[PDB]
């Protein structure tokens, strides 16, 4: 019953295209239809970034079924560069949309400069340069080591002299990529809506329930997408088969899902975009 390899590669296959199609389609709608507003710069770059993470799904899926890395060293370095680099770029761009919507509600005249295209673009260049550090590290530090019979591709670290630098960089990544991004976005939303309730007709009560609705989804997405993998791959660094390596690859896909689900959330739920895309594809 090789169903388990079949189900998982399906998930990698379903998730691959929805992210690839959407992010490609979302980008090509933006670049042609709406050349820009600040939100447009964010969705495009998030799409462009979290498009390139879904590019890394074949290579990661190959190793699952094949249980080895047939693509060599140089192709392991760039894939390790691409996947790390545009995980951070997508999480950071996804987080930077988070403070952008917060700044408008709570510091409204400070939004007058934050919401300018140049401000977004300035913030939206720095954010790639920040991720670039991770991209540069993954190139040099990325390589291929023989497991025993099985070649493996990962971030190559010296294992001599009680060196736990792998657990450190997995600690380092987990807090840079998950915790302080979650806390930023979980704060900026939970604080933005407090000003909303503070405003003191039923336009508040209806809209509060509506934005609370919308807010919970993204954090529900981001939590369930990355919490199970980040928990899993840390435990694999302190300690601990066939079924476990499948549960782990299921959790990898869940992280991949956030990059495929994002265009639906951050474009198809934005009317300033959803209105435009509709025409191109509903003429």
């Amino acid at each position, epitope marked *: 019953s090789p169903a388990i390899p079949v189900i998982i590669t399906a998930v990698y296959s379903v998730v691959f295209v929805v992210g690839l199609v959407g992010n490609s389609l979302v980008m090509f709608v933006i670049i042609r239809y709406t050349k820009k507003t600040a939100t447009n710069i964010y969705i495009f770059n998030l799409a462009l970034a979290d498009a390139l993470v879904t590019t890394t799904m074949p290579f990661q899926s190959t190793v699952y079924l094949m249980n080895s890395w047939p693509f060599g060293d140089v192709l392991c370095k760039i894939v390790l560069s691409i996947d790390y680099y545009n995980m951070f770029t997508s999480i950071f761009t996804l987080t930077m949309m988070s403070v952008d*919507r917060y700044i408008a509600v709570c510091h*409204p005249v400070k939004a007058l400069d934050f919401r300018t295209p140049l401000k977004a673009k300035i913030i939206n260049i720095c954010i790639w340069l920040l991720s670039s550090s991770v991209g540069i590290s993954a190139i040099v530090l990325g390589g291929t080591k023989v497991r025993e019979d099985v070649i493996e591709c990962s971030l190559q670290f010296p294992d001599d002299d009680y060196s736990w630098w792998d657990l450190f960089m997995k600690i380092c990544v987990f807090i840079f990529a998950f915790v302080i991004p979650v806390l930023i976005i979980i704060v900026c939303y939970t604080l*933005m809506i407090l000003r909303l309730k503070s405003v003191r007709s*039923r336009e508040k009560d209806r809209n509060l329930r509506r934005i609370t609705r919308l807010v919970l989804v993204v954090v529900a997405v981001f939590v369930v997408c990355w919490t199970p993998i980040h928990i899993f791959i840390l435990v694999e660094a302190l300690g601990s088969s066939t079924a476990a390596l499948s549960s782990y690859y299921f959790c990898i896909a869940l992280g991949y899902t956030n990059s495929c689900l994002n265009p639906i959330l951050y474009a198809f739920l934005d009317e300033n975009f959803k209105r435009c895309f509709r025409d191109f594809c509903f003429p």
Partner: nanobody
Amino acid sequence: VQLVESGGGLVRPGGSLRLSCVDSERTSYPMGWFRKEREFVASITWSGIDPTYADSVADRFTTSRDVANNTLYLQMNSLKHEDTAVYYCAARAPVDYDYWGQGTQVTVS
């Protein structure tokens, strides 16, 4: 009832000025701005997250709404003679903009 359009006034070319229509009587929420025929500059949502920019010159203006103070702003930057016109905030029904402010004319030359 009555909307007090602040800001306005003359300015030099390439300059800036922030306009701020407000309804402190909290009767109407100014959610959009309006500027030949009537011109329609950008508007914003009630809670002030997402603005619908104005295509004409979206490289020059930004808007924001203080939800708590029931105030809508807009500060034009590096505008030209094309932007010179009368400007009036447009309010909304409490629960097809229903209330329209008297308006102020920015005059640049």
